Structure 1
Amino acid sequence: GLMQFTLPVRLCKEIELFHFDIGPFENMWPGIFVYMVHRSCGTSCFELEKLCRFIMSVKKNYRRVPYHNWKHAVTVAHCMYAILQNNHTLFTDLERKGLLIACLCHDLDHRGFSNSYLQKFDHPLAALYSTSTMEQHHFSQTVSILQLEGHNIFSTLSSSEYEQVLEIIRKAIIATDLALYFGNRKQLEEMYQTGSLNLNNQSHRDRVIGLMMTACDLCSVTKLWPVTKLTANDIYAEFWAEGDEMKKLGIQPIPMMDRDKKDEVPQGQLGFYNAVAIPCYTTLTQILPPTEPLLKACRDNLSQWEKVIRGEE
């Protein structure tokens, strides 16, 4: 009860910033997550022993793929931690609990392939879930882990608080399906511009939490340039493995996934910052002004990708 997690001074300070990198020491990531739950939520949100057991079952159910791995889970949760801490009074007690957990869990048992590849390969998961295929799988793995003995970190919630939190987590994990992001942000755009956005409207909250999820999920583009650049290598390592597998099914992959079109990467990064990232963090900054450093950091990394194209690196 009187047992805080604490971090070394450089981490204690830098973890509060949006651009924090959780570092290469895997064995510290659990402690970092618990630190964030404790400051974001309270030392009383979760029975420490249940939390620690839940975190380690989550780690065990992430695979050793280049990008969609246990480091991604904690990175995405840290971005959420930063949004929640800079927007203290906008979120309920249940939202704070459920969203860090949602982010830790959002890519559970990912294999490093897209929903399209599952559908072209005819994976069983693609018959069980016709849209948002991996994301319905991730929520389903979260429920599984929550129902292992000693793993129910929400035990102390009421029957209806319990259902409201599992419903927040579900919507939060579905929203990480980038196919849903485009419409979700268009609507958030119109609602904010016509002045109809209303955070007491539960369907409005849902959309705003969905946009936060997309922001946290993409937060590689909001890091210091060397983090951004070295993360992009892990991303393409998956994309190109997927492209190889497409070719094995006798399908020309999209260029994003063709290792034979490495030369086009800098321009594809621009497409991505302009079509997805920048619009994402813009609308997020409009709705939640203290998240502006994500937008500023994204625009800086766009400008570093422009330099790469110009041969200035």
Structure 2
Amino acid sequence: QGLMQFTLPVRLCKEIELFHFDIGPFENMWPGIFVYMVHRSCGTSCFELEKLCRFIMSVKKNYRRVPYHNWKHAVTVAHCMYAILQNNHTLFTDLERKGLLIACLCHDLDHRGFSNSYLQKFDHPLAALYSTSTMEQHHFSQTVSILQLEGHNIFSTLSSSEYEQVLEIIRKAIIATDLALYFGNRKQLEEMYQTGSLNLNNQSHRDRVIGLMMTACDLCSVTKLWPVTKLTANDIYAEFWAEGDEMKKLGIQPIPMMDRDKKDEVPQGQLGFYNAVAIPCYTTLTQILPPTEPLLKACRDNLSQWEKVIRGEE
């Protein structure tokens, strides 16, 4: 029917509302977690259940078994968007609620565990098709593909216009997950906020703010309980070191972040990353959207955990 509420066990029903929720090690629970979130974030109405499930499963099929950029990441990034949307209920459009959780689930579709840099140095065909934001244009493209499979059009109820608006929100959202673009995006959002020019009625300004949300969900492994934060950092380094290995195979010394012989330098690299990227992201995000403050506090706690690791205090 449409009298078919999804529900979660008590500890999950309560903790899922919190920014620092971990979706856990039971792969088979993640789909239902996503639907739960769509239904609460959007409504039981916004998507035909049978179509949703078929889409979610095809998206899952199209994530690979890489250590980090995998289906678990997909659903983790959707959950942080869910927490932001639920703490800023009245700021977002009907179309924005629909399209943003879907953008997040799709945002790393068919990722191979290599940076856009590697694609470019290897001379991968995707580098020729898409010169900038290489994987990000691929992920958008794979999303549109899965939307076009029979029985997969979860947007079928929208008007011709709604449809192009929602697919334009997803495309920008997914493009924004390219961290090379984050720096300029946040610097402009910072000056807009501080000269008071920021105006959520300017589509151009919304666009930037959704981009920043996108970066903030994407990095949300820096906002978890220390033991999640630490064990997730291992997964991302396993991709970085394999890429370092492949750079070496093309005859290129990798940066030390990616050199698995320079493992000692992880803790100081996380510091640099928290200082250069994460802290500034969640800072500007908290200024624009005050109820997202717990992501900043959690990030700062984790920074301080990484300083303890350097000081040999663990």
Scaled by the length of structure 2, the TM-score of the pair is 1.00
CA positional deviation for 1:56: 0.1
Q: What are the within-5 Å matches in structure 2 for residues 79-118 of structure 1?
A: 79-118=80-119
Could you give the per-residue CA deviations for residues 106-159 of structure 1, whole angstroms, max 9, x where no partner exists? 000000000000000000000000000000000000000000000000000000
CA positional deviation for 1:301: 0.1
In 2, the alpha carbon distance for the partners of 1:10 and 1:265 equals 34
Could you give the per-residue CA deviations for residues 277-300 of structure 1, whole angstroms, max 9, x where no partner exists? 000000000000000000000000
Q: How many residues align?
A: 313
CA positional deviation for 1:54: 0.2
Structure 2 portions without partners, runs of 5+:
none
In 1, the alpha carbon distance for the partners of 2:160 and 2:185 equals 30
In 2, the alpha carbon distance for the partners of 1:256 and 1:297 equals 23
Could you give the per-residue CA deviations for residues 191-240 of structure 1, whole angstroms, max 9, x where no partner exists? 00000000000000000000000000000000000000000000000000
Could you give the per-residue CA deviations for residues 241-260 of structure 1, whole angstroms, max 9, x where no partner exists? 00000000000001110001
In 2, the alpha carbon distance for the partners of 1:211 and 1:4 equals 31
CA positional deviation for 1:70: 0.2
In 2, the alpha carbon distance for the partners of 1:56 and 1:74 equals 12
In 2, the alpha carbon distance for the partners of 1:97 and 1:230 equals 31
What's 1:216 paired with?
Answer: 217
In 1, the alpha carbon distance for the partners of 2:255 and 2:200 equals 39
Could you give the per-residue CA deviations for residues 142-190 of structure 1, whole angstroms, max 9, x where no partner exists? 0000000000000000000000000000000000000000000000000
In 1, the alpha carbon distance for the partners of 2:42 and 2:255 equals 42
Q: Secondary structure at the match of 2:254?
A: coil
What's 2:235 paired with?
Answer: 234
Could you give the per-residue CA deviations for residues 50-86 of structure 1, whole angstroms, max 9, x where no partner exists? 0000000000000000000000000000000000000
Flag as ranges the 4+ runs of structure 1 deviating above 3 A.
Answer: none
Scaled by the length of structure 1, the TM-score of the pair is 1.00
What's 1:128 paired with?
Answer: 129
Q: Secondary structure at the match of 2:262?
A: helix
In 2, the alpha carbon distance for the partners of 1:272 and 1:95 equals 29
CA positional deviation for 1:49: 0.2
In 2, the alpha carbon distance for the partners of 1:254 and 1:309 equals 20
Q: Secondary structure at the match of 2:200?
A: coil
In 2, the alpha carbon distance for the partners of 1:177 and 1:87 equals 24
In 2, the alpha carbon distance for the partners of 1:2 and 1:231 equals 38
Structure 1 portions without partners, runs of 5+:
none
What's 1:50 paired with?
Answer: 51
In 1, the alpha carbon distance for the partners of 2:58 and 2:265 equals 39
In 2, the alpha carbon distance for the partners of 1:272 and 1:177 equals 15
In 1, the alpha carbon distance for the partners of 2:156 and 2:4 equals 21
Q: Secondary structure at the match of 1:85?
A: helix
What's 1:15 paired with?
Answer: 16
In 1, the alpha carbon distance for the partners of 2:256 and 2:206 equals 36
Q: Secondary structure at the match of 2:152?
A: coil
In 1, the alpha carbon distance for the partners of 2:117 and 2:265 equals 22
Q: Secondary structure at the match of 1:259?
A: coil
In 1, the alpha carbon distance for the partners of 2:80 and 2:257 equals 26
Q: Secondary structure at the match of 1:260?
A: coil
What's 1:203 paired with?
Answer: 204
